[PDB]
Structure formats: structure tokens, C-alpha cells
Amino acid sequence: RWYPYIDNGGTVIGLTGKDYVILAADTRLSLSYSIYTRFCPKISKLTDKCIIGSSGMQSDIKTLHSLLQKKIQLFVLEHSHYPDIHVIARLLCVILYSRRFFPYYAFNILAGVDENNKGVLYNYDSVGSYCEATHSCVGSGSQLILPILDNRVEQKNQLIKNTNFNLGDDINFVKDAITSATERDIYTGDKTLIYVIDKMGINVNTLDLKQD
Amino acid sequence: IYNYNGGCVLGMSGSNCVAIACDLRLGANTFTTVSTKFSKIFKMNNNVYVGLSGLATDIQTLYEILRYRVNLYEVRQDAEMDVECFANMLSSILYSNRFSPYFVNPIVVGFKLKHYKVNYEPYLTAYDLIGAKCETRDFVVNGVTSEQLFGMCESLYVKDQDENGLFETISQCLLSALDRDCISGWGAEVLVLTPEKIIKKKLKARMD
Amino acid sequence: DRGVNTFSPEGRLFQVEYALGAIKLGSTAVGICVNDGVILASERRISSTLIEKDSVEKLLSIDDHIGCAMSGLMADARTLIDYARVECNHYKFIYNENINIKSCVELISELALDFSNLIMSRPFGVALLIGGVDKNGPCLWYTEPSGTNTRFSAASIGSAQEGAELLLQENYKKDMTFEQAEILALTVLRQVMEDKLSTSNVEICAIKKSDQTFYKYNTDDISRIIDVLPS
Amino acid sequence: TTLAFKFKDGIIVAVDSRASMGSFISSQNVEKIIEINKNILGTMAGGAADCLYWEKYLGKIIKIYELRNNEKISVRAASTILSNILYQYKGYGLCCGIILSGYDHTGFNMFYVDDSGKKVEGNLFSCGSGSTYAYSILDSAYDYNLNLDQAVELARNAIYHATFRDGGSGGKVRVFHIHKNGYDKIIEGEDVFDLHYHYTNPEQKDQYVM
Amino acid sequence: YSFSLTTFSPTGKLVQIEYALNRVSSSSPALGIRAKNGVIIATEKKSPNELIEENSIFKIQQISEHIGIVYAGMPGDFRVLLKRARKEAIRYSLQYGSEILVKELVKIIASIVQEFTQTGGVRPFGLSLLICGVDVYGYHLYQIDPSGCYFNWMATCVGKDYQNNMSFLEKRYNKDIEIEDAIHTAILTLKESYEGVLNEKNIEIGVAYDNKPFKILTQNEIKDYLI
Amino acid sequence: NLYDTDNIIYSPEGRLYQVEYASEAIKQGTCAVAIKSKDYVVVSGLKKCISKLSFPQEKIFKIDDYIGISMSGITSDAKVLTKFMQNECLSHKFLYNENINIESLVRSVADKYQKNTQKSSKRAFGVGLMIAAYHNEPCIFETRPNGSYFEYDALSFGARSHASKTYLEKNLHLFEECSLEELILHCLKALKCSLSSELTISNTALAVVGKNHPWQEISSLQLEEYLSKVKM
Amino acid sequence: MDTLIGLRGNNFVVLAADTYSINSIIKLKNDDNTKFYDIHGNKCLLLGGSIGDRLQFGEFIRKNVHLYQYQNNTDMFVKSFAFFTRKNLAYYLRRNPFEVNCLIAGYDKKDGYQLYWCDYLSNMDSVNKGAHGYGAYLVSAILDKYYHENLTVDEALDIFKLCFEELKKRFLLTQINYELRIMYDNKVETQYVTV
Amino acid sequence: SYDRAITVFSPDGHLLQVEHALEAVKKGGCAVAIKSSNFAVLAVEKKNIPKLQNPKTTEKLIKLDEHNCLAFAGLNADARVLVNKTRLECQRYYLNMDEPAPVDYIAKYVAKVQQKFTHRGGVRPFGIATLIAGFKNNKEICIYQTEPSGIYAAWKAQAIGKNAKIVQEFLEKNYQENMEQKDCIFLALKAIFEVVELSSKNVEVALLTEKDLTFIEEQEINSMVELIDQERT
Amino acid sequence: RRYDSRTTTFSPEGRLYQVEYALEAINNASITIGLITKDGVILGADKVFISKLIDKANNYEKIYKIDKHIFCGVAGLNADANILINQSRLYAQRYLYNYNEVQPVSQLVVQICDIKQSYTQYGGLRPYGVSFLIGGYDTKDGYQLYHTDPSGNYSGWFATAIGTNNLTASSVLKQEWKNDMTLEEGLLLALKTLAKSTDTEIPKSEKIELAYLTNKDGEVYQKYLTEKEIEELIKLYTQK
Ligand SMILES: *C(=O)[C@H]1N[C@@](C)(CO)[C@](O)([C@H](Cc2ccc(F)cc2F)NC(=O)[C@H](Cc2ccc(F)cc2)NC(=O)[C@@H](CC(=O)N(CC)CC)NC(=O)CCCCC)O[C@H]1C
């Protein structure tokens, strides 16, 4: 009579561009109505041009990320080249479906840049379904941020339209979205890590959010 | 579960004469029958008979298991098999599936040979669905219609009896029992074995 | 007298060396690797005329982007080929990309030494000349029963493999065109037959760099290559 | 809502693009048709991960069989393989719903496969929440020996009306055409919004009432 | 690693089984007689030094209430065969609720001996059992061999000089022989076989008197019979 | 004479002949050589080339960050051992999030040697491994077909190893407390002594690992520069 | 749900069943072929229940019976076929149940034309006539009324027509289309009926 | 022994157990197979003691499936075992693919099984050479051959058993494409009787079509043996 | 390895060397006869004489019954016979359990020859040194009689003899046997060929044993001839 599933809570935001991908996530761990620590990064770097973020059970995402890094390192050792993001996506799909009947409580986002300098973004469920996207979000705040990303990126139900978008505006939009989620959701967090990927490697910054 | 394919069996003893009888119904969903020939009596040896009452698939499966074991025993020993040995082996088989059992309440009816000439001693016994043997020495009844048969036999049993009177007694007991059960009936057969011969007869029962 | 996995005094395994003896006989085959692709061929050692010659095929495909050429005990070779294509499709399921040829030959060599408990019962007695194309580039590989696999620009297996290697050493040159490679392969193959070269007497396959796809040459392509063949 | 029917110039397959975690849609664009073989497709319904993983597994096994035997597989064999493996996971929680359609040596063939090993051969099928609406509109207006343009128009309108009375179905329509030498994508993806305001509300005045 | 050490030679003959019969022929003899109203198993034990007690070593045993056994060969083989035969009688009685038939037990032990001849990584049993018993179908007497083949006898002898003991027992035997005369013929047969002098604690006897339990005679009863 | 039919039979002198034959297979293998200083372990080896059309075989292999090996003997056995060591280090870093202790890994592979030497119907590996790593100190280990392992300042495997060993013990004192460049140079002198018939960029392998220096094979241009320095 | 009807007499046997592929509240088809399973020789197996259960069980039983006939080079007896099917169904009932009804029929030289009823719990017995499903209630008494000894095939088909008319008129699932399977004079004739 | 290698490479690089299986095949009785257009003819010899042996119990020539057929030469018990294995695999394929097993798949599976027993411990090679006849998935007649080594190939005509080289030499100089049924039966009966005593009782010939395998009656065989006996003399 | 017997391993000629020695063991055994008759099928045999104190009553050591409709005659080692008799009975009752009809004899002999072939091929265990003359009745094929061997080969025979002096017995069967014949004529011919094989002018009643199987009254039953019946048969043989 013990349920092996708890929502530690959080949110991971993802957004793409012509030759870059922006992924952002909280740095809060928690329980139902109480917080463990104010610093628990959910984003794990996988390759030089790929990262993975998640939300749900902390132990499951840690085990999944370390297992995926093990498989990637074994792949590089056996095959003498780094795996592409599509390869990692299919591998994570097979890993998730292996535990179909005791699934991981982990809603994953897989970001990176393809060999042709295209910022990809795959979004997952608990079991293994995955589809490429230009915008996605998972976790507790997913219902909050996802309409906003639909308004900004897809920009349907509009007539004037504006597709002129660049890296700084996309980053600032992600900061606005995660701040709005922090105001409007209790599990979100207090400090967030804005991972940015470009052809010239990876950069990571940090931002301070509300502590409530 | 025994309402699904309700059935009844019966067996009496007498003076160098033994009888066994059964109903010929096969049920489905309790209150609708599908056949009027499903005999619960199965011949197994020249002087041993067995009456299986309960679920029809378990009746048939237990019949083939016991036939396998029996015919193995006569073929290896090269001699006819005894009623007590068959009864003990039947009790062991029913116990061997103590959990998830065969839903069947069988009986055993036959003759006991005492060589010296030879004397044929009657033998009758009954079982639960596990093999709770109990020697009885007179009328033995088993099935959903068991209570009615117990009521009939004590009024109608006359200790040792002639084979004709035994046939009348067992026939009237079975027919009066089956008339008072809705899910049991649809004809009957009465097998009256003796050392000289066996008489098999079917009764003009309330089969409707 | 002795077990399968008994070392010799010189440190060589007896069964492995005897398996190396078995590959010395068989159908001759030749492989060439160039920038534009890879080529394989076989002498097509035809039996009596009552054979169809379609069922007797020496150039199978591990995958869409890999070919092969067999030598030695052929049933053992088909077993190795079957395991190889199964593992390559397993890679294609687990990973979207096409498997590199190096990993395929490594898995084949891993199965070949399965008889040494460290299941099968003896060495396979097969030499393979695997060729394919991947993102790293076109290449071909050599396999033998001892498990060591070495990677080539041009090689040969079978009966007349020594003379084929000598002619390839004399004639092969780097920065070659694919047509030059085809005519070179047919010249070497023709020189090492017993019978005269013809259309049904030879079979060819190739995997282009652009197509990245296995493609066995038919009778028309073989006749076209033979007609422009110097003599 | 998936769709498949058979006509003179082969088979037309149509699907939606919605994806629901319950009352909330996960993604509005997806791909519910997988090239299992060069000459065979298969729709997707029910549990997304289950159907996706099992058609990819079936495509793997088909590549094994074709590469060994050097002969293209039939749709009946792939459907039988799928129904056999799905029956092994009976009573476990799978909700795979599949319509397999393609050309083989026998001819144009079409099969329906479910999580319960429900292999059924036919010429018209549809699985999903909006299956009934598509079935109704086709069986009102499906005929053999009609043109390809009429077929794509019929499939598009059926998918539209299935989306119209089904919140679960929506997004975009993807109508594919199967013929002898493989297949072509007639409609890669087309929004249902302009489809509605062309079909049912051609004049953009007042809310449509029903 | 499991392979048959026993194998067919040219002309067959099962050389290991022949060596097992050679073991039996050199081992201390045993015999049994089937009478009109009883069956006997008897055997001589070697003239013991004073430190041995016959109340510990027993070549005569009982498998059931009515069934006895005697052997001639290796003792440990006889011990394991006796224990497993007891298990066979017990499982038959558990199933069918009766004392085991002699024929069924003989068939099972013969099958076990054949299994040990056939099974890899083992050697045949170096003895020859002699089972006697009473059941519904009269009295019986059987003889197991290392080959795993059983023979139905009315009177037989095993061990050293078994041909001469067979001839002597054939000379003095009748189908309608009484049980006491059968015991006397057993004593005379073993006396001719030993080529020495006999007494209590040098011989051992087992007998089944009619439909009664199988009985092993004490030294007092044997001393009474010797007089 | 007759005590070399199986690997489970001691001779009258008390020697396993099969294990000695596996060591003989190692000794007939291609060359290799390793050197360490104070904060660097350099590894080099002669890559086998059977024909001018054949390309050089892989000699040096990478196992984990800051760990690597070199090969001499049966190559399939080396493949098995490499897969085992790679799985062990990656599993350790999985379950514990730290680099594995190198000598524990060496004991693990030596145990794998032992269990195959010991039980019948199995053979010892015909390969010895030249393990080099930096687990907070440069280190060079060795494995043999019998379950056994020793630690070295410098080592060589098979081929004309006598010339290399003579050069190494002639110059062992200067290896400690010298820079990385001279260390690479000395390793190349040892391999050139093993040649006895010229060293080129294609036919030689070279790897470096040390403090703030993960395991990385030397590029073609740098290796050509060092080879030209050796020639001069 | 799935109606199966069967009749047997002197020198004929008839089987019948509706042609419907039900999924949820609709029909995948009106011309189902998953219920009948022709066996090599004068034999047949008619199944009713869930589609996948009858598919797996019928193919398994058919292809094992074919294996027996090919290995042994003789036609399997009808009684052996029926009891083998019952034993397989009972074994699978105890472990991995197949909710599927049965109607085994065939012709044998030694037993003649004969039929066997069998339920989803392997409740098997020989009968001259029987039925399955909820439609068994509305057609079995007709079969009692109009069956008599020395019947003919045409009279049997008239009885089946009466049963189909009753199932169309009165049974909740007004089943229109049916498929028949007649065995007589060493032939196996199939018919399709639409009342 | 249990689970150890008994077939191994000789010093010359040959698996001597496989050649011993080939001599076991060569001692076994002869068999012939022909195909043309849309049918095939199968012939095997026969040897019986007159007045004692029952010819019906012989199963040299058999049927595996609705369409596939098989003939063999070697140890009959091993043939029966592998025949039961192939029939099991035929019905296993027909339950997992819902199409009848083509001849190419069964020939490949027989070769795979014979290589498996040749390449595993605790089992000696199947001492039989089979040749399978059947229809491909595209309704094309093709007859396959199979050796104990696991070698298989498709032939228009080929023979096995005693004196197979002589029969194969005869068939090379007499085979024609798209012959009549009577012509194929005539050619097979000539070919088998090159190395077999001339009598009707020493053969069991049959003809395979898409309908079923049909064994030729004794009267037609008697006419055929009489006709070729006249032709030789 | 060093102590291996080389059982499952081909000869240079392809014979395995082990079934051959088994067959030489068969040829040294007591002779057994087989005959098919219009009324039945007969499996007469010859007892090996161990001692006069063997129980003459019953003790049928050569002929055994597998079922009410199947019975066979042993021509080799008795233990290897009896274990296979038990396997045969198990297979018969298993088929009756599975299918609820009697097993045809062809199926049964296929099963025994398959299990004998297994130890000839799989493992390193010796083969069974026994050859049977299995006979019985079925509705599919009627009275049949077969000849099994350690190789796993079986073949149908209308009449045959195996064991020692099988050549002379088979010659007598070829000379005397007829297609349609009575049970008494078959029994007399069985005595004749047993006497010819045993090198005796007149057969001894104690030295032989007979059995027959007839489908009388639609219920097959086996009879095993006693000493008095064999004495009457030998009296008729001397009269004839
Ligand atoms: C037509 O009628 C149409 N209806 C819908 C859209 C209704 O949901 C669906 O059934 C759809 C299938 C689908 C979706 C995406 C995709 F890429 C492929 C695909 F085939 N069904 C669903 O999406 C699942 C609903 C469901 C139905 C039956 C069940 F028994 C269980 C669930 N929802 C999902 O698969 C969801 C998570 C999931 O796996 N669940 C629900 C918690 C079951 C464990 N995954 C996604 O939505 C996509 C990944 C997340 C993207 C961020 O298709 C046709 C029939």
C-alpha cells in the first residue's frame, strides 16, 4: 500500500530559432507543499551540441539522464563519433518504452543543434512518444506557458504578423515566460538556468526569480 | 458454480447385487439445458464403475486422467484392478490439485473380490472435491440434488435386497429426487451390475 | 586427440589455423574502394548447366548500404551474414542512423570467436570482404576466422587470392575514378579465372557515395563494362 | 481519427494531428502515418507510444524478412505479425489501434489491427474517437471508380467533420495516396481553420449555428 | 562431460555388466525357495571374528510387511537400492492405499538398474538382489541382476559355486514342498556350498509364513532347526 | 610432452604449459612501449601493416577519460577485455558519479584471466594489456595470461622488446622530472630501437594522458614534427 | 453476441452463423469470415466470441490438425478433433483463458455425420443440434419443434430460414446476413443468406 | 558426449564428420527430381523383400505441406526426424504469416538446421541429402537441393544417392525446358534406371502440381519400364 | 574427454560403429517370429533355457502387450526392452488421453524409433540394444506388423523372423506363407519355422511361446497360449 510516485514539481521551457535553441529550467526541488532545496538543476548536458531537461520525480530524471549519458559515452567509444540529436531521441524513446508498465515519472525535453546547424527540440511523455517542435514545455507549469509560446511562435489568430525574431528577443521572451510562471505557479522556482546553444558551442547563464 | 451444469448421481447395494444411477442433463447458464444424453457414469473396469458429478469439463478431464492411470495399472500388473486401489488413487488425484481444484464431487461403485471360489463383496464410497473419502456400506449420493436423495433412500432402503427390488428402489429414489430439482433431471439411466451380468436400463422420467 | 580451444606450443590455436586452411579454397573474389564508392566481385564458380545460377549467389547485402563477398564454408558464411543483418537492423531500430561498417565487422568477429567460452562449438571457417558507405566515407573491410579484422583499399579472397593481390598492388592507384575501378576489378578478375570472362560468368555490386544504396549490376551493366574493357 | 478506403487508383489514407493528455492537448502537429515499407503505410491511434513503437518494430521485422528472403512482404503477413505480437501483451494495458494498407503481389490490400489481436481485412476502415463520423460521411458518399481528386476531397471533408464534433481530433489533415510504385503525399499538412471557413461558413458573417 | 562409460564392444556383451556378474559370483552366496505355503530367502555370512556382531550387519531386510530381500555383492549398492525400494513401496501405498505388489517393485528396481547402466558418468550396480514376497496372487520369488533384468523362480541360488548349488537344489525340491522341508533344503544346500562347519551367527534366514508378516529368524530358532 | 593436452594439468616440474603458450603468443605479437614521468604517462606502439594496400591496424585503444591501454597478442581477446573494462568504468561512473579506482579495475580483469585459466573447457586469453592512467598519480600496469599484475615505471611488449628494454633501463633515471616533449622523444627512441625499417606517421601510434590532459592521440602534424625531431 | 447455429441428422450436417465484425457500437463489416475454419478433410470448426480469441484459437487448432494429418498421412477422426479441441481449450482456460464458443462438425467413416456442442468453459458433448450466443434462446425451440428423424437437407435449410427470420424479427440485434456451411455426400457447400 | 564439439576441422581444413555423412548419403538409395513449366516430377528407388515386406510402409517420397514435397537419400530415421521438424516449421510459418510456406524458405530452413547440427556440440550431422520441390510465393515452380554441410542451391534437374554423378551426367545431356508430363516421367524413369535394376517394383515416382501430389499408378510404370527396356534392346 | 567412448560419432564409412555392435547383439539373441493372418497377427518365439526351476506358469519374457490392441516380441536385451515397453505404454495412454481414441500402431512405432534415434544422435549415451516385432490392429490399416531396430529404422512386414538363425526362419516363411490363411495354419507354420530355426525336428512345448490378436466380435483381444494348448498344437503338428 505504498505508491512509488511523487510530483516533486517544476517546469522546463524550450524555444528554437534558425541556428540556435534556447532551453530554460528552474533550480527548485520540492515535495507536495514544502521545498527541499533552492538549487537542484534538472538540465543535464549530454553532448557538445545537445542537452536534456525533465520534470517529475527527481530520482527518475537523475537515473535516466545518467543512464543516457552512459549510453552516449559507450556509443562514442564503440563508434568513434558523437551521436546526433535524432539518434539520442530514438534511444531515449526506446529507453522509456522499456519501462512501459512501471513508467518513469519524467516529462523530458531534448534540445540541441543538428549537423546542418538547425536548432531542434523534441518533447516527450512518460512512456516514449516524441515529436519535433519549435516550442515546448513540460512539468507543472506546462499548461500555463504553452499558450504563450503558441501566441509568440506560431502566432495564429493574428493578421498583421511579425516573424522578425532574433536570439536576444527569444531569450528575453523566455525570461518573461518563466517569470510569469513563477508568479502564477507555486512549484516553479526561485533561480533558473537559461541554456543557450549555438554553432560556437554552448553558453549557460543564471537568473534570480521570486522566493515564495 | 455447480448450478452451472447441475447433476446428480446415486448408488445402492444389495444381496450380491449393486446399482448405480445418474441423470442425463447437461446445463448451460443454469436454467437452460443443451443435451439429454450426458451420462455421468463411466465404465472403467469389468467390476468397477465411477460416477462423476459437477462441472462437465472437469468430469471429462478427470475421466481421461483416471482412464490413463487405470489402463496403465492393468497393463503393467497384467491383472484386474481393485476398487479400493482405484478409490485411493482417485483421492490422491483430487488432492493433487488441492488449490485450483477440479469442481467435481465423484463417487465409486463396484465389487470387492475375496479369493480363497471367490466372493463378491459390495463396495460404495463418496468424495468431496478434494478426496474426503468416507466408506458408507449402503446408499451413496452426491451432487446438487444430494439432500433429496438422502431423504428418499432412508425411507426406501430395505438393507440387502434382490436386484429387481434394488432397481425399483434406486429408480424411485432418483426419480423422486430429480422431480424436486429444477436444474437436474432430463432422463435417467440405471446400471445394475452382478457377477453374472450387468443390466443397463433407462427410465421414462419427467424429461421436460 | 585435443580440444577445440587447445593452444599450440607456438601460441596459435589449432582450430583457428585449420580454419585459415579452409578459406584457402573457394570462389575467388575481389574488392576495390575508391572515393566515389566501393566495388565487389566474384568469379561465380558455376556448377553443371542444370543449376539455375540465380539461387547460387555470392554477393549478398547485410543492409541497404553494405555488401559482402564470401569465401570458405558457405553455410557458416550465411549464418554469419544472417546474424550481421539482424544486428544491423537492431542498430537501425535502436538508433535512426545507418550502422557504420566497422561496427558490423566487429560484431561479426565477435560472433566468430563465440566457440571460445570467454552457444557455438567450433570456428566458422569463413573469410568475408565487406564493403559499404557511411558518413565517414566509403571503405571495405576484411574478416577471417582468427577474429582480427583489417581495413583495405583493395583486396581479394578465395583460391586465386595471392595473384589477385599482386595484380591489385601493381595496378591500383589512389585518386581513382569509379569507372577506372570497375575496369581494374574486371581486369584482375579476368586474369585470375580459369574460364573466359562473360556476362553470366561474373557478378558485381557497388554502393555509390551519392546513392548510399546497395545495387547489384545486372547483365546489361556487366556487358557494358566488358565491352569497354581493355585487352 | 484515422481513415482509409480503397478505390480505382489505389488507397487514400487520412489522419488528424491532435494529441491529448486528457482535457489538454500536448501538441497540435504530429505524424500518425509511418512508412513501414516503401509500398506499405500504417495509421496510428489510441496509445501513441504503443502504436509508434510497435509499427517501428514491425518495420524492423519486415526489413529482416525482405532482406533474408529477397521478396516484398504482403500486408496480410505484416498484419498477422502485428496481431500476434500484440496478443502476447493481452491484458497488460495496450490500446494500439492500427489500419495497415499497401500494395503487394496479390494487389491492393487493407487490414485493421487492434490491441486485442483483431485482424480484419476490408476496403474501408476508420479508428479513433471520430471514427463514426468519418464512417458515416464515407458510407453516405463513398463509391468505387471515382477520381483521385474526388477521393482526396472526400477524405479531407470526412476528417474535417470528424474534427468538428470531436475535441480529441483536430489540428491538420494529412491525406496520403498509395499506388503501385510507392506513395505520394497529396496534402502534407493543411489547417482545418480555413477548411471550415471554406466548407461550412463560406461567408464570414455571424456565428454558425447548429 | 556426461557420457556412457558402459558401451557396446565388438560382439556387444556389455563388458561392465559381465564384470558385475563376476563381482556377484565371487561374493558371499544367497538363495531362496518358494514353497506351497511360504517363501524363504537365506544366505550365509562369512565366519566372523569375535569383534563383529551379527545384530548390526544384515543381509536380510524387509521392504514392507510381506516383502523381504537378500543380495550378493557390494553392500553400499544394496543399501541405496533398499532405501529407494522402500520409497517406491511407500509412494505406491500412498497412491493406491495397499501393500505393494512384488512384480511392480521388481519392474521399478530393474528399470533403475537399467538407468544406471545407461546413464553417463556412472557404473552398474555390483550385486544381484533376490526379492521374495506374498500378495493377493500367491507367493513370488524374483532375482535382479546388474543388467536390470528380472527372472521368476521357484527356487534359486546366487554367488560362489552357484551352478553346483542350483544342481543340488534341483535334486532336492518339489513344487508341493512344505515350508519346514524348504528350510531344511536351504540349510543342506548352504552346508554343501560352504565347505566347512556351520552354526548360529554364521547363517541368516528370512521367511514369510503364509499370509502373515515377513519374519527374520533369530539365532535360537536357527539353532533349533540345525539340530 | 603429454602434460600440454589441457590447461588443468601440472607437469612434473609443476608448470601450466598452456598459460606459457599464451605468453608465447603475447611475445610473438607486435611491439608496444609506455613511459611515465611525474605528471604524464605516454604510450606508443607499432601498428601492424600486412600489405601496402592494407592500412595500419588499431593498436592503441581508449577505455575511459584519463584511462587507456595498448595491445599485444590475440586481438579478439583484446576486444573482449576492452568491452569489459569500458563497461566497468562506465557502470562505476553511472552508479557512483566518480572515476573508478584503476587498480580495482586491474584486479577485475586479472580475475577474469583467472576464472578462464582455472576451470576446464576454457582457455586463457592470448593477450597482455599495457594499462596507463592518471588516478591522481601517473601509473603503468601490466596483465599476463595467468592471473597476475605488476606496476612499472616503463614497459614493453613483444617483438624486439630487448632493444627497447635495454634503452629504457639505460635511460630510466632521466624519465622522472623531464618535460612532456622529451618524454615523447624518448618513447620514440625506444620504438625506433625496436624497429632495427623506418618510423612514419602512418605506421606508429602515440597517446598522452596526465594532469589536466585527458587521453588523446597525437595528431598527424604534431607526430610528424616529433618524428622529424627524432630524425634530426 | 455472435450467433452460431448447428444442426445434424442422417446424411447431412449444417452449420450457420451471422456475418458481422462488431467493434464497440459499429460494424467493421457485414461479410465476416473469421468465424468458420475449414479443416482438411470433411471437418469444420465454427467459433464465436471476441475476434482475436477465435482467430488465435481457430488457427492454432486448424494448423495443429493439419500438422497431424501431414505427419501421419491419414485423415483425423471427427471425435479426435472435437476432444483435442476441448482439451486445448480446457488447458488454456486454466491459464490464459479464451472466451470463445465452439461448434465442431464433420464426417467420419466409422461414426458418420456428427456434431458437437462446446461452450467457452469447454462444456462439450455430442448433440444432434445446438446453438450459441443470445440468439440460441430464440432459435433452439424452433429446432426442437421442426426436427425429426430421416430429415433432408432442404427441410433443414427451411428450418434455418425460419430461425433467421426469427432473429431478424424478434432478437435485439436484428441479424440479416448469415453464412452457412453444409456437409453432405462427401462435399462441403457454403451459402450466403440475407432474409 | 553431452555438449562438446565432435565435428572439428582436420589439419587439411576439412570437417571430417561432414564427409562421413556424405559417404552415408552415398550408400543411401537414389532419388531424382525434374521440373518444367508449372509442375515437377519426383522419383526415388525402392527395395523390398518379395512376399514378406509391405511396400506401403515405405515413406521415401512424402508431402510436407499443401504444395511442398520432399525426397531424401541416407539414413531414414534422421530423414523422418527432420521431416517432422520441417512440417512443424511449415505450420509455424503459416500461423505467423498467414501465407503457405514457399519452397525457398523451407530449403533455407533445412540448410539452416543441418548447419546448426553441424555447428553445435553434443550432436552429429544429419546423414541425409534432401531435395525439396514446391511452388514459390509468386506461383513459380522451383526445386531445391540440400547437402549435409548446409549447402543448398536451386536446380532444374539433379539426383542424389548411389551413383548420383552418373545420373547427373545423364540428365545434363537429356534435359529440356517446358516438357510434357509424360516426357518428364519418361526422362526421370530413364535417369533413375541408369544405375538401378530394371523393374516396376524398384521405383516410386510421383508428379507435383498446384492441386496436389499424385503418385503414378503401377500400370503406367509397367508400361514405361517395358518401353525403355524395348528401347535399350 | 580422455575417457570418452565415441558413441555419437560417424565411422569413416558412415555407420557409427555402435548400432552395428547392437545388431550383432541382436543376432545372438533368441529367435522371434512374426506373421499376419486373415484372422489375426502372431508373434511366436523361443525361450532361452536358463534352468528347469524357472516358473513355467506365466513368465512371458519375450512377448509383451503395450495395449489391448498392440503387442510386441522382444529380440534383444531384456532391460532395454522393458524400459521401452514402459515408454510405449505411456505413449499409448497419452494419445488416448489427448484424442480419446486408440493410437494407430504406425504412430506408436514412429515414437519408439524416434526416441531410440535420439540417443543414437544426441548426447553420448549408448543406444538401446533391442529390436521389436510390433503388431496390432487399427481401423485405418487393420492388422499390421513391423520390425524396429536400434538405428530408429522401421519397416512393414507381412511375415518376418529376427534373431539367431533368422535366415533359415525367413526362408521357411518365404516358402510356406500365403496371402489368405487361417489362424491355425499360421500357428502351425510358426511351430514349423521355430523348429527349423532351433535345429530341432519336433519343437518342445516348454521351449516355445505363442500369442495372437484377433478382432473377434468387434472387440480386439489378445490370447497367450498355455502349456496344454501348445501341447495340443504340437500334437496337431506331428499329425500333419
Ligand atoms: C482520432 O480520433 C484521434 N484522436 C486522438 C488525437 C485522441 O487523443 C488520438 O487517439 C491520439 C494518438 C496520437 C497522438 C500523438 C502522436 F504523435 C501519435 C498518436 F498516434 N491519442 C493520444 O494522444 C493519447 C490519448 C489516449 C488514448 C487511449 C488510451 F488508452 C490512452 C491514451 N495520448 C498520449 O499518447 C499522450 C500521453 C500518453 O501516452 N497517455 C495519456 C497520459 C497514455 C499513457 N502522448 C501525446 O499526446 C504525445 C507525446 C507528448 C507531446 C508533448 O489519435 C486519433 C485516434
Side-chain angles (χ1 to χ4, degrees), chain A residues 83-114 116-145:
Chain A
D84 211 347
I85 299 87
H86 302 284
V87 174
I88 298 159
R90 175 60 151 281
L91 169 55
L92 169 56
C93 179
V94 173
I95 286 156
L96 287 165
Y97 199 84
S98 66
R99 264 150 78 71
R100 164 62 178 76
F101 305 121
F102 199 109
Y104 296 74
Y105 204 110
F107 296 106
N108 294 315
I109 314 191
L110 184 65
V113 163
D114 270 21
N116 322 297
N117 313 327
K118 289 171 50 46
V120 308
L121 200 75
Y122 282 103
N123 49 68
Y124 282 68
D125 73 288
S126 81
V127 187
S129 296
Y130 70 109
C131 45
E132 192 185 330
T134 176
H135 64 315
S136 196
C137 180
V138 303
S140 58
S142 159
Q143 313 214 350
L144 295 191
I145 298 100

Side-chain angles (χ1 to χ4, degrees), chain A residues 123 125, chain D residues 1 16 18-20 26 30 32 44-46 48 95 128-130 168-169:
Chain A
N123 49 68
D125 73 288
Chain D
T1 177
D16 59 288
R18 192 151 287 190
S20 296
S26 66
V30 299
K32 293 162 182 222
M44 273 145 68
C95 191
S129 308
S169 308

Side-chain angles (χ1 to χ4, degrees), chain F residues 53-57 59-78 80-120 122-159 161 163-165:
Chain F
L53 302 167
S54 173
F55 285 100
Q57 281 197 268
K59 162 62 74 161
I60 293 169
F61 293 106
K62 153 163 168 84
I63 301 299
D64 174 68
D65 293 331
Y66 294 120
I67 296 147
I69 63 170
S70 196
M71 202 215 68
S72 176
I74 305 282
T75 311
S76 161
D77 293 331
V80 173
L81 273 298
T82 46
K83 292 222 298 303
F84 174 78
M85 297 175 44
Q86 288 180 325
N87 274 256
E88 281 295 330
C89 312
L90 292 174
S91 178
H92 191 271
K93 187 160 36 178
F94 171 76
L95 298 171
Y96 297 130
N97 317 301
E98 45 174 6
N99 290 325
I100 192 167
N101 203 356
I102 190 65
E103 193 164 330
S104 174
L105 185 62
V106 174
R107 289 178 184 172
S108 309
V109 302
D111 284 349
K112 183 178 284 293
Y113 276 103
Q114 212 283 310
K115 304 304 163 255
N116 292 331
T117 80
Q118 168 92 349
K119 178 191 309 284
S120 169
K122 315 173 68 84
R123 83 200 182 65
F125 304 101
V127 67
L129 313 183
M130 162 176 318
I131 297 164
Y134 187 105
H135 191 247
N136 70 44
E137 182 156 339
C139 59
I140 298 167
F141 293 90
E142 193 204 20
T143 78
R144 290 156 167 218
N146 75 318
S148 167
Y149 67 98
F150 315 108
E151 185 177 1
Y152 288 93
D153 310 332
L155 182 59
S156 314
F157 273 2
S161 291
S164 294
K165 284 173 75 213

Side-chain angles (χ1 to χ4, degrees), chain I residues 147-160:
Chain I
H147 162 68
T148 286
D149 62 357
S151 66
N153 276 286
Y154 72 105
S155 65
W157 292 87
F158 303 116
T160 190

